[PDB]
Amino acid sequence: APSPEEKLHLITRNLQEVLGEEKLKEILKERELKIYWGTATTGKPHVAYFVPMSKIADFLKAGCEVTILFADLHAYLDNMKAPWELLELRVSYYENVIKAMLESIGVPLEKLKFIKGTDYQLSKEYTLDVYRLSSVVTQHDSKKAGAEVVKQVEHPLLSGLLYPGLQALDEEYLKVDAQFGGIDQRKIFTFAKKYLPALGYSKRVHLMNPMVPGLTGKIDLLDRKEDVKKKLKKAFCEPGNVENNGVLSFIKHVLFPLKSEFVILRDEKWGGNKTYTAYVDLEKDFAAEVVHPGDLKNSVEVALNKLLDPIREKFNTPALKKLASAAYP
Amino acid sequence: APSPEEKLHLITRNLQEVLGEEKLKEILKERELKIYWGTATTGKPHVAYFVPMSKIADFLKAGCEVTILFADLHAYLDNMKAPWELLELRVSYYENVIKAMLESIGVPLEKLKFIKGTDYQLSKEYTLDVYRLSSVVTQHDSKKAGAEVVKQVEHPLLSGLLYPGLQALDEEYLKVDAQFGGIDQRKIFTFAKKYLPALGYSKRVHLMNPMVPGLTGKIDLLDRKEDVKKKLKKAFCEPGNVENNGVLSFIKHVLFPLKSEFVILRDEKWGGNKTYTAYVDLEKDFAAEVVHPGDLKNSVEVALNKLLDPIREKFNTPALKKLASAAYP
Ligand SMILES: N[C@@H](Cc1ccc(O)cc1)C(=O)O
Ligand SMILES: N[C@@H](Cc1ccc(O)cc1)C(=O)O
Incomplete structure (x- = not known):
């Protein structure tokens, strides 16, 4: 193997x-x-x-x-x-x-x-x-x-x-x-x-x-947490719409391959968290509107911030920001 | 100077x-x-x-x-x-x-x-x-x-x-x-x-x-004398015509610069040889038809064969003809 x-x-x-x-x-x-x-x-x-x-x-x-x-x-x-x-x-x-x-x-x-x-x-x-x-x-x-x-x-x-x-x-x-x-x-x-x-x-x-729709379309790898937050709930994510959905696409092409599962964060009122082992299951639930746009975004936002944190910290060192600025003047 | x-x-x-x-x-x-x-x-x-x-x-x-x-x-x-x-x-x-x-x-x-x-x-x-x-x-x-x-x-x-x-x-x-x-x-x-x-x-x-009209248009630098002869009196050279004349052009652009003069070879009957110190004089005589196409060609043929002789002889050595053949198969 x-x-x-x-x-x-x-x-x-x-x-x-x-x-x-x-x-x-x-x-x-x-x-x-x-x-x-x-x-x-x-x-x-x-x-x-x-x-x-x-x-x-x-x-x-x-x-x-x-x-x-x-x-x-x-x-x-x-x-x-x-x-x-x-x-x-x-x-x-x-x-x-x-x-x-x-x-x-x-x-x-x-x-x-x-x-x-x-x-x-x-x-x-x-x-x-x-x-x-x-x-x-x-x-x-x-x-x-x-x-x-x-x-x-x-x-x-x-x-x-x-x-x-x-x-x-x-x-x-x-x-x-x-x-x-x-x-x-x-x-x-x-x-x-x-x-x-x-x-x-x-x-x-x-x-x-x-061709994969973007999460927004604009989130930079070095964007700080509140900019990530800010940019995410301006993202396009219609209830029930599983086509042309950049949030669902990001989950399908990045978060599932990364972890083999994806956790939807939902209040107890609406069923509490749910763990999907395949994308098609999550897609079916989104289509049925029992995964709300807001909760999908919050779940992606948590996962994404986990992905960006070590990047932000590594570029937090002296000279990496001079590099960032000099590369893009 | x-x-x-x-x-x-x-x-x-x-x-x-x-x-x-x-x-x-x-x-x-x-x-x-x-x-x-x-x-x-x-x-x-x-x-x-x-x-x-x-x-x-x-x-x-x-x-x-x-x-x-x-x-x-x-x-x-x-x-x-x-x-x-x-x-x-x-x-x-x-x-x-x-x-x-x-x-x-x-x-x-x-x-x-x-x-x-x-x-x-x-x-x-x-x-x-x-x-x-x-x-x-x-x-x-x-x-x-x-x-x-x-x-x-x-x-x-x-x-x-x-x-x-x-x-x-x-x-x-x-x-x-x-x-x-x-x-x-x-x-x-x-x-x-x-x-x-x-x-x-x-x-x-x-x-x-x-753009200079050719002597024929085909005389190769290694063409032997009788091929040069053969190719020259098939050349285009109308009596009196000083435009689009490849023979006159060759004289103007090559033989005059080379020697500062050009000698027309003519029988005694038609005035005997004449030596021109400027192209315009030769052109005037050709226009007037007192330099015949045949004599102009003979004069060029002699001069040209003088130019080709050391080339032909230098490429007469072993390996220069293998070079000639291998270059153009
Ligand atoms: N054409 C690729 C970049 C690329 C350049 C050279 C390559 O050999 C391969 C890929 C792009 O648009 O992103
Ligand atoms: N273009 C020229 C040949 C040439 C090639 C490269 C040069 O730099 C100069 C001249 C010709 O047609 O005969």
């Missing part, structure tokens, strides 16, 4: 889509899966990052070799969502905050590798492959592949066309079997699947999370 | 257009001009290469520091007009044949520097500047800048969009004051003028040759 079947279940649970199941099962019969997730080092990560972090936790539980790519060059190429001056600073802020998140979840930062894009994306071998890729990829396909991912501006920049090619080559240079990201990466993933073989590199397994 | 005025005259004579006269004259008051010419290492050079080589001869006579760029990566990016396997071979063939041309003209290969693009275009600093350029250049402008230069195909490749940016950066990395090329480079030259300052680099002086 875990068997290949248990590993496959941990790796794929809560995803919207799995591309490459045949190869995924072939690998898992024999060895650990090598997988990575990338994030461009752009705006301050917020509590919604707990969603991909929960999948990273799952990968690590399944025994996967996991790489996290801090894609600083990608931040630069995507309409300068980060300038060159600030890239090193934002890489450090991202690395710190992602490590704190994973620590807070209780994930062995063990088979976990952190790498930043400019560690290898400016090397001669990689650059040579960027030019080879450029010689088989049409402008049309590269503009198409990036449409849901890079900022769409009225006069498209060349950098925006380069972005998906580099993301494709990243699969080969990080030497992984698989890449995980949101469903909005799908066109880049199929682009990699199409073009890496023209360079003599193999296609990868691709794992995609659904 | 040469004075700045004589240097300016040598450098700019026979050009179609000079961009940047103000800076050119500022430089020449003080020091030697640093200038380069690039050629993608694509198809076999033919006798038409004598036209840019004549300007290189002029630059060297004026005391310029001249670089010749063998743009092998550019050959690759331009719709794979050369594959990666053959690039080293075609670089060697080009270097050999260009050096033989210049030797045949009688040009001191002295302040002459040969460099190949992949010597520096895959370095970290250059690649970083390719990404910065990509972040300010629109796809629109880079497609526009390359329209007369890179192969135009029905599904434009990304590499074609990269091509002019690299040509612009080449001005900075070769540390020149100026670039010389044909008038068909003009949109790339103005592109460099527009964008190098966004990277903190200065605009360059740009020197442009006219």
Whole structure:
């Protein structure tokens, strides 16, 4: 234990889509899966990052070799969502905050590798492959592949066309079997699947999370307790509505995977607390309106504040706030 | 001697257009001009290469520091007009044949520097500047800048969009004051003028040759004498027509600069030989039809065979024909 079947279940649970199941099962019969997730080092990560972090936790539980790519060059190429001056600073802020998140979840930062894009994306071998890729990829396909991912501006920049090619080559240079990201990466993933073989590199397994509504949409990982409180009961959460509910989604994609259960906090009057061992049970009760929006929010607020506390405390040290300020001036 | 005025005259004579006269004259008051010419290492050079080589001869006579760029990566990016396997071979063939041309003209290969693009275009600093350029250049402008230069195909490749940016950066990395090329480079030259300052680099002086009709259009630098003969009296050369005349153009752009004069070979019957000290005099006589097409061709044929002889002999050595064959299979 875990068997290949248990590993496959941990790796794929809560995803919207799995591309490459045949190869995924072939690998898992024999060895650990090598997988990575990338994030461009752009705006301050917020509590919604707990969603991909929960999948990273799952990968690590399944025994996967996991790489996290801090894609600083990608931040630069995507309409300068980060300038060159600030890239090193934002890489450090991202690395710190992602490590704190994973620590807070209780994930062995063990088979976990952190790498930043400019560690290898400016090397001669990689650059040579960027030019080879450029010689088989049409402008049309590269503009198409990036449409849901890079900022769409009225006069498209060349950098925006380069972005998906580099993301494709990243699969080969990080030497992984698989890449995980949101469903909005799908066109880049199929682009990699199409073009890496023209360079003599193999296609990868691709794992995609659904688009998950936010808790608000704005809660920062360093927001203090009363700001978390303040922001939560302005959140959208209609009685009985189990669609497009950011509070239910957060529970489904983060709190259940984290603990295998979820506790609703309710007054004695309305039945007292209840412990759910599966999301579908909680969903049924919410649909029936015997879990009120206010109690759902209070239950999430307690759980979430538990997740943020060690992060807030770790960034409470001198120099981490100078880092926070300097990263985002 | 040469004075700045004589240097300016040598450098700019026979050009179609000079961009940047103000800076050119500022430089020449003080020091030697640093200038380069690039050629993608694509198809076999033919006798038409004598036209840019004549300007290189002029630059060297004026005391310029001249670089010749063998743009092998550019050959690759331009719709794979050369594959990666053959690039080293075609670089060697080009270097050999260009050096033989210049030797045949009688040009001191002295302040002459040969460099190949992949010597520096895959370095970290250059690649970083390719990404910065990509972040300010629109796809629109880079497609526009390359329209007369890179192969135009029905599904434009990304590499074609990269091509002019690299040509612009080449001005900075070769540390020149100026670039010389044909008038068909003009949109790339103005592109460099527009964008190098966004990277903190200065605009360059740009020197442009006219588009010159070919002697045939096909005479190879290694063609033997009877093939040269054969190909010449199939050439287009109408009595009295001094426009679009490839034979007159070759004389104007290559043989006059080379020797300061040109000798028409004519029978006693029609006046015997005549020596022209300026092109306009020869042009007037051709217009008046007292220099016949056949005699003009014979005079060019003699001069040209004199230019090719040491080239043919130098490539007559073992290994230069294996080079020729292996470069072009
Ligand atoms: N495109 C990803 C970031 C990314 C960058 C480079 C990669 O190799 C992988 C992922 C995003 O939008 O979040
Ligand atoms: N564009 C030039 C070749 C060239 C390539 C790179 C340069 O830096 C300069 C010139 C041609 O068409 O012949």
